[PDB]
Write an enzyme that holds these catalytic residues in place. Structure first.
Site, PDB file in Angstrom:
ATOM      1  N   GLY A  21      24.797 -15.147  22.205  1.00 53.91           N
ATOM      2  CA  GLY A  21      25.046 -16.223  21.261  1.00 53.91           C
ATOM      3  C   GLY A  21      24.672 -15.942  19.818  1.00 53.91           C
ATOM      4  N   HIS A 135      18.039 -10.575   2.916  1.00 52.43           N
ATOM      5  CA  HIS A 135      17.090 -11.705   2.978  1.00 52.43           C
ATOM      6  C   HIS A 135      15.648 -11.331   3.280  1.00 52.43           C
ATOM      7  CE1 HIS A 135      20.442 -14.410   2.739  1.00 52.43           C
ATOM      8  NE2 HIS A 135      20.959 -14.043   3.914  1.00 52.43           N
ATOM      9  N   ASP A 168      25.897  -8.742  -5.487  1.00 47.59           N
ATOM     10  CA  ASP A 168      25.950  -9.196  -4.101  1.00 47.59           C
ATOM     11  C   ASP A 168      27.117 -10.159  -3.896  1.00 47.59           C
ATOM     12  OD1 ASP A 168      25.233 -10.695  -1.683  1.00 47.59           O
ATOM     13  OD2 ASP A 168      23.113 -10.113  -1.947  1.00 47.59           O
ATOM     14  N   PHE A 181      12.568  -8.425  -7.465  1.00 44.15           N
ATOM     15  CA  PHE A 181      12.677  -7.963  -8.850  1.00 44.15           C
ATOM     16  C   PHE A 181      12.724  -9.099  -9.902  1.00 44.15           C
ATOM     17  CE2 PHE A 181      14.693  -4.639  -6.140  1.00 44.15           C
ATOM     18  CZ  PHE A 181      13.744  -3.664  -6.347  1.00 44.15           C
ATOM     19  N   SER A 191      24.320 -12.431  -8.077  1.00 45.76           N
ATOM     20  CA  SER A 191      24.765 -12.920  -6.777  1.00 45.76           C
ATOM     21  C   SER A 191      25.825 -13.993  -6.904  1.00 45.76           C
ATOM     22  CB  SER A 191      23.571 -13.491  -6.012  1.00 45.76           C
ATOM     23  OG  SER A 191      23.934 -14.035  -4.747  1.00 45.76           O
ATOM     24  N   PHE A 192      26.929 -13.845  -6.154  1.00 41.71           N
ATOM     25  CA  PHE A 192      28.018 -14.824  -6.111  1.00 41.71           C
ATOM     26  C   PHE A 192      27.885 -15.382  -4.705  1.00 41.71           C
ATOM     27  CE2 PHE A 192      30.186 -13.381  -9.927  1.00 41.71           C
ATOM     28  CZ  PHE A 192      29.749 -12.084 -10.038  1.00 41.71           C
TER      29      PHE A 192
HETATM   30  C1  LIG Z   1      23.128 -10.403   6.970  1.00 47.24           C
HETATM   31  C2  LIG Z   1      23.134 -11.192   5.672  1.00 47.24           C
HETATM   32  C3  LIG Z   1      23.513 -12.663   5.825  1.00 47.24           C
HETATM   33  O1  LIG Z   1      23.321 -13.256   4.558  1.00 47.24           O
HETATM   34  O2  LIG Z   1      24.866 -12.776   6.205  1.00 47.24           O
HETATM   35  C4  LIG Z   1      22.646 -13.396   6.850  1.00 47.24           C
HETATM   36  C5  LIG Z   1      23.010 -14.863   7.092  1.00 47.24           C
HETATM   37  C6  LIG Z   1      21.895 -15.613   7.814  1.00 47.24           C
HETATM   38  C7  LIG Z   1      22.155 -17.085   8.114  1.00 47.24           C
HETATM   39  C8  LIG Z   1      20.912 -17.794   8.649  1.00 47.24           C
HETATM   40  C9  LIG Z   1      21.110 -19.262   9.039  1.00 47.24           C
HETATM   41  N1  LIG Z   1      19.833 -19.875   9.361  1.00 47.24           N
HETATM   42  C10 LIG Z   1      19.566 -21.151   9.058  1.00 47.24           C
HETATM   43  O3  LIG Z   1      20.409 -21.918   8.600  1.00 47.24           O
HETATM   44  C11 LIG Z   1      18.131 -21.573   9.280  1.00 47.24           C
HETATM   45  C12 LIG Z   1      17.669 -22.976   8.889  1.00 47.24           C
HETATM   46  C13 LIG Z   1      17.831 -22.624  10.324  1.00 47.24           C
HETATM   47  C14 LIG Z   1      18.999 -23.195  11.133  1.00 47.24           C
HETATM   48  C15 LIG Z   1      19.279 -22.375  12.381  1.00 47.24           C
HETATM   49  N2  LIG Z   1      18.053 -22.216  13.230  1.00 47.24           N
HETATM   50  C16 LIG Z   1      18.347 -21.433  14.463  1.00 47.24           C
HETATM   51  C17 LIG Z   1      16.936 -21.598  12.442  1.00 47.24           C
HETATM   52  C18 LIG Z   1      16.598 -22.423  11.210  1.00 47.24           C
HETATM   53  C19 LIG Z   1      21.962 -19.361  10.268  1.00 47.24           C
HETATM   54  N3  LIG Z   1      21.525 -19.111  11.527  1.00 47.24           N
HETATM   55  C20 LIG Z   1      22.591 -19.233  12.371  1.00 47.24           C
HETATM   56  C21 LIG Z   1      22.505 -19.102  13.834  1.00 47.24           C
HETATM   57  C22 LIG Z   1      23.619 -19.356  14.641  1.00 47.24           C
HETATM   58  C23 LIG Z   1      23.533 -19.250  16.021  1.00 47.24           C
HETATM   59  C24 LIG Z   1      22.331 -18.882  16.609  1.00 47.24           C
HETATM   60  C25 LIG Z   1      21.221 -18.627  15.821  1.00 47.24           C
HETATM   61  C26 LIG Z   1      21.306 -18.734  14.439  1.00 47.24           C
HETATM   62  C27 LIG Z   1      20.103 -18.257  16.770  1.00 47.24           C
HETATM   63  C28 LIG Z   1      19.733 -19.563  17.547  1.00 47.24           C
HETATM   64  C29 LIG Z   1      20.977 -19.823  18.419  1.00 47.24           C
HETATM   65  C30 LIG Z   1      21.930 -18.648  18.047  1.00 47.24           C
HETATM   66  C31 LIG Z   1      20.899 -17.509  17.862  1.00 47.24           C
HETATM   67  C32 LIG Z   1      23.646 -19.567  11.555  1.00 47.24           C
HETATM   68  N4  LIG Z   1      23.247 -19.648  10.246  1.00 47.24           N
HETATM   69 CA   LIG Z   2      15.377  -9.050 -12.252  1.00 49.84          CA
HETATM   70 CA   LIG Z   3      25.673 -13.243  -2.616  1.00 43.19          CA
HETATM   71 ZN   LIG Z   4      25.822 -13.659   4.610  1.00 42.48          ZN
END
Ligand SMILES: CCC(O)(O)CCCCC[C@H](NC(=O)[C@H]1CC12CCN(C)CC2)c1nc(-c2ccc3c(c2)[C@H]2CC[C@@H]3C2)c[nH]1
Ligand SMILES: [Ca+2]
Ligand SMILES: [Ca+2]
Ligand SMILES: [Zn+2]
Length: 368
Positions: A21, A135, A168, A181, A191-192
């Site tokens: 998942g 991140h 980015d 930085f 960053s966009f």
């Molecule tokens: C590599 C660079 C990048 O930039 O693209 C990385 C993007 C990261 C997005 C992170 C985002 N997290 C959040 O929105 C943080 C506020 C929370 C909500 C979700 N819960 C699980 C934790 C707390 C988020 N988390 C999920 C997410 C979706 C589905 C799942 C999860 C996370 C874990 C829990 C259930 C499964 C595994 C979606 N969005």
């Molecule tokens: Ca700077």
């Molecule tokens: Ca960006």
């Molecule tokens: Zn992303």
């Protein structure tokens, strides 16, 4: 003219698994590699296997306690680390998985090795699709990222470059890199990203840096549905102004593919051509360039995107008809490289785009 391109890849990277998942799929890096191999893009690139970055290399930025934790934690001993897991934000978004530390070592190794190759003037461009994990913080994992390979690669470039420009194009704000930085003028971060009720919640256009870093952090907040036309209209003018004012001697470009139409987590509407236009724009300045991966959660589109951006780096034209490959069935029903935008509404009106661009131009006038 045409530039020398060095590409970093470890064949084991695609085997790391975040869990059932979880949207982050390292397998997309292997799909990208196999697709670019089948297009013949290996004939013009130097392909290297990155070394496994040591805990010591990672502590050039991250805390010793945080790196010691990453090197020690495993699914079988997780019960004994409940306290440190909370402290370091290891849990749902950033789970403990088999080989976690080795995955970080390979992601980081590619970025740092690419930066060393650029510093030695042995390549014009270095590509590490396994990197771009923007991140991660000094002592905390965040948003599927554990070790900030970007910050480490930038620290390496700073050994030979007075000013480094970081750009980015991931749909999420590049918060870990901007934070690292924020108080220095030796790195300008641009960053966009989608801003408003969206992770990580940072990247307001009023966040412009602090102390010696004031005016050296640039943020372009966007709404849902941005398309190729709108993105192209602001990217080249902003990057051209940043190049003119800042005069960087090296560039790092995070190519997160979650800004493409149809992404599982993103809500933008760019095509692969629109996303790749950013690479073409940056490449035109003829500066040492480190191209990195990042987000991207509709994995057939991530493979298409990074295959096309590798072709762009090489100045090699490739056909729209996909060659046969190990993951051919993932590219149906069309089996084409390029994608079509959806019918989603672009909430970024032309007036909004111009207004934000003009506010960023005012800030850029404040540089020396
Ligand atoms: C590599 C660079 C990048 O930039 O693209 C990385 C993007 C990261 C997005 C992170 C985002 N997290 C959040 O929105 C943080 C506020 C929370 C909500 C979700 N819960 C699980 C934790 C707390 C988020 N988390 C999920 C997410 C979706 C589905 C799942 C999860 C996370 C874990 C829990 C259930 C499964 C595994 C979606 N969005
Ligand atoms: Ca700077
Ligand atoms: Ca960006
Ligand atoms: Zn992303």
């Amino acid at each position: 003219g045409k530039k020398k391109v060095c590409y970093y890849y470890d064949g084991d990277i695609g085997n790391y698994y975040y869990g059932q998942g979880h949207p982050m799929k390292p397998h997309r890096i292997r799909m990208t590699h196999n697709l670019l191999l089948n297009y013949g893009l290996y004939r013009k690139m130097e392909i290297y296997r990155p070394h496994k970055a040591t805990a010591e290399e990672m502590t050039k930025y991250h805390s010793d306690e945080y790196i010691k934790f990453l090197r020690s934690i495993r699914p079988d001993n997780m019960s004994e680390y409940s306290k440190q897991m909370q402290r370091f934000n290891v849990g749902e978004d950033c789970p403990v998985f088999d080989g976690l530390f080795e995955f970080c070592q390979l992601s980081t190794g590619g970025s740092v090795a690419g930066a060393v190759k650029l510093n030695r003037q042995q390549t014009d461009m270095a590509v590490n699709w396994a990197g771009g994990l923007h991140h991660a913080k000094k002592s905390e994992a965040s948003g599927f990222c554990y070790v900030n390979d970007i910050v480490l690669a930038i620290l390496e470039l700073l050994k030979y470059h007075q000013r480094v420009l970081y750009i980015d194009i991931d749909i999420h704000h590049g918060d870990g890199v901007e934070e690292a930085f924020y108080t220095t003028d030796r790195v300008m971060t641009v960053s966009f990203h989608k801003y408003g009720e969206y992770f990580p919640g940072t990247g307001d256009l009023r966040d412009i840096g602090a102390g010696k870093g004031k005016y050296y952090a640039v943020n372009f907040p966007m709404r849902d549905g941005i398309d190729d036309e709108s993105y192209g209209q602001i990217f080249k003018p902003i990057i051209s102004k940043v190049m003119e004012m800042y005069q960087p001697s090296a560039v790092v470009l995070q190519c997160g593919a979650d800004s493409l139409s149809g992404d599982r987590l993103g809500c933008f509407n760019l095509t692969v051509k629109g996303h790749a236009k950013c690479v073409e724009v940056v490449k035109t300045f003829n500066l040492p360039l480190l191209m990195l991966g990042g987000g991207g959660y509709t994995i057939r589109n991530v493979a298409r995107c990074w295959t096309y951006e590798t072709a762009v780096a090489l100045d090699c034209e490739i056909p729209n008809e996909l060659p046969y490959n190990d993951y051919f069935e993932y590219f149906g029903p069309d089996f084409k490289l390029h994608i079509s935008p959806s019918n989603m509404t672009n909430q970024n009106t032309p007036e909004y785009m111009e207004k934000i661009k003009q506010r960023l131009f005012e800030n850029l006038r404040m540089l020396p």
